[PDB]
């Protein structure tokens, strides 16, 4: 069955071709047995992907006891690195990333680390979502803090994914990313400076004692208008970005309203977008492996 063996990257992903299926796919090697923490990621990933179903969200068709999934040409990272974008392309990419967000949120599952390195593209000019391992039902180390929500950064509602998608939209509009940092305090300082000083009415939800004291012991700064930061954008784009990037977690834009925003109202039809068909730890080792085997049991002769 498997032929056309080649190299992709590194577990490890390699090119392959199924003789029986007559289709081209990629295979990735997973070895989470060494650490329970790695196994926790593995258990969620097989369980979350298999139960979901949708066109935009990536899917799994077979497991070789070594995971068989479709392959795309390149991700958003390389395209954003090389080629600049245009208005129509930005519009289309935003309408689709949001369409996926609606299903995952409707599915009542919490996502995290929705960075553009986890968005894939192919020749047919379509976008997809791939990685779903660190997730939860509505001191964890994340690869990048650049695109994280601030109530996570400073010690969970649904606003975090909206924050993520807003950051991706801004990074698509402007060539460079918006919030670069090196230290945790550095990122906090950059975010506070760009978004303006936190008002006391805004400072009610935060409960950490030392963090509350720190944020209280700050000077006052004036918010920068978005027109000054972006002199070659659309008024609708600026308005949507401003509404998305909000300090108040209990008062910020929800997904349904965003899709029907005037910016994207042209490609939005209420009947078109779908809804989820079905509404949605400890440290075992041996029985955890048993559960992994039980979950993966279906994908073999």
């Amino acid at each position: 069955r498997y032929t056309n063996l080649s190299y992709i990257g590194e577990g490890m992903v390699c090119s392959a071709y199924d003789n029986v299926n007559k289709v081209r796919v990629a295979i990735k090697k997973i070895s989470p047995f060494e650490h329970q923490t790695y196994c926790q990621r593995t258990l969620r990933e097989i369980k979350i992907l298999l139960r979901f179903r949708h066109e935009n969200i990536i899917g799994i068709n077979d497991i070789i006891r070594y995971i068989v999934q479709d392959l795309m040409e390149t991700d958003l990272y390389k395209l954003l690195k090389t080629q600049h974008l245009s208005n129509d392309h930005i519009c289309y990419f935003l309408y689709q990333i949001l369409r996926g967000l609606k299903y995952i949120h409707s599915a009542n599952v919490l996502h995290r680390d929705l960075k553009p390195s986890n968005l894939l593209l192919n020749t047919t000019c379509d976008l997809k979502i791939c990685d779903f391992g660190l997730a939860r039902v509505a001191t964890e180390y994340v690869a990048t803090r650049w695109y994280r929500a601030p109530e996570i950064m400073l010690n969970y509602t649904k606003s975090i994914d909206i924050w993520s998608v807003g950051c991706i939209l801004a990074e698509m509009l402007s060539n460079r990313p918006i919030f670069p940092g090196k230290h945790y305090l550095d990122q906090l300082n950059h975010i506070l400076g760009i978004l303006g000083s936190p008002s006391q009415e805004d400072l009610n939800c935060i409960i950490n004692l030392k963090a509350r004291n720190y944020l209280l012991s700050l000077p006052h700064k004036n918010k920068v208008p978005w027109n000054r930061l972006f002199p070659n954008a659309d008024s609708k784009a600026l308005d949507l970005l401003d509404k998305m990037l909000t300090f108040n977690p209990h008062k910020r834009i929800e997904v349904e309203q965003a899709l029907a925003h005037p910016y994207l109202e042209q490609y939005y039809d209420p009947s078109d977008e779908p809804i989820a068909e079905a509404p949605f730890d400890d440290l075992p080792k041996e029985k955890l492996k048993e559960l992994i085997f039980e979950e993966t049991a279906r994908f073999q002769p």
């Binding site: 305090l185 550095d186 300082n189 400076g193 004291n213 000077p219």
Partner: protein, 330 residues
């Protein structure tokens, strides 16, 4: 603005002569910008402020602005010491950063003097006579014979204190302990402990003070020092500050440590540099002030200045107009 100088037909007037330097050019206008900057710095301190100690683990009332100071070892034994003592005796500074050579030289100066000399003298002849060389200054070898006879009991008591009662030693604390023992009103580290101004020096092992520690180890072993606790103190001394200022008086590790501390709060608001380094080598010591703003160590609103001159001929004059004319205001 035109370019003019002192006429000198009016007679010698020192007040105007040091004030006319701001419109001469070259290194004089740098001096004028420097004096204007430091004068702007102090004016913010006097403003009233109208808990914090527990967070920072320090016993000192927070003022309207905290001023950071640092110096290189060769400066302390060069006669500038009187100016530093004047700056520290009355509260005018809040953090001092130095090198182990600085404390080593400063302690002996209270016990024995140092003599002048000449720049060009062969060391082969001087070694026989028993004279060491530090720049244009010469020190005797007899001077180092009393330090060894004075530091051993202190270390013995320190080891006893560590073993008997619970205590962990940090470089910011060994300096303070030495001050109370010297009991002299002319050593700068005596007044440091009286008014609670901490002194930091990460590279404390390297120096003549290290030599004494090595010999003591082979008779009463067990001494422990920790460098991770000092980092916390210096960083939280800057994170919780309303406004900050820097006066770096020489290149080296002192420049790196002080600047990196202010990185965690988006740079400082006023700064001044005085050193004689070069920039083509790329060394941190010779870095221009505009290089700091790239890393995020000097805010983009400030206007730093940097003067190329030896510290001996500039520092005493700078303190003449800035910090001395408002003594009664404290």
């Amino acid at each position: 603005t035109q370019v003019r100088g002192y006429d000198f037909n009016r007679g010698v007037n020192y007040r105007a002569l040091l004030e006319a330097f701001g419109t001469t050019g070259f290194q004089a206008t740098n001096f004028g910008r420097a004096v204007q900057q430091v004068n702007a710095m102090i004016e913010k301190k006097l403003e009233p402020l109208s808990q914090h100690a527990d967070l920072t683990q320090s016993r000192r009332p927070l003022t309207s602005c905290t001023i950071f100071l640092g110096y290189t070892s060769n400066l302390i034994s060069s006669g500038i010491r009187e100016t530093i003592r004047y700056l520290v005796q009355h509260n005018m500074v809040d953090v001092l950063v130095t090198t182990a050579g600085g404390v080593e030289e400063d302690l002996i100066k209270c016990l024995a003097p140092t003599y002048l000399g000449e720049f060009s003298l062969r060391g082969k002849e001087l070694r026989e006579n028993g004279i060491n060389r530090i720049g244009n200054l010469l020190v005797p070898n007899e001077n180092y014979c009393k330090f060894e006879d004075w530091l051993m009991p202190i270390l013995d008591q320190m080891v006893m204190e560590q073993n008997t009662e619970g205590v962990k030693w940090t470089p910011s604390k060994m300096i303070a302990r030495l001050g109370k023992e010297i009991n002299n009103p002319e050593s700068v580290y005596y007044w440091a402990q009286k008014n609670h101004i901490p002194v930091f020096s990460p590279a404390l092992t390297d120096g003549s003070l290290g030599d004494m520690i090595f010999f003591h180890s082979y008779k009463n072993p067990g001494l422990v020092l920790d460098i991770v606790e000092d980092l916390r103190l210096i960083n939280t001394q800057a994170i919780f500050a309303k406004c900050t200022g820097m006066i770096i008086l020489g290149g080296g590790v002192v420049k790196h440590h002080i600047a990196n501390a202010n990185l965690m709060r988006n740079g400082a608001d006023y700064a001044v540099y005085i050193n004689t380094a070069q920039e083509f080598d790329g060394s941190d010591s010779g870095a221009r002030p505009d290089e700091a703003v790239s890393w995020g160590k000097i805010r983009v609103d400030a206007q730093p200045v940097k003067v190329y001159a030896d510290a001996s001929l500039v520092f005493p004059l700078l303190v003449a107009e800035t910090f001395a004319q408002k003594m009664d205001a404290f």
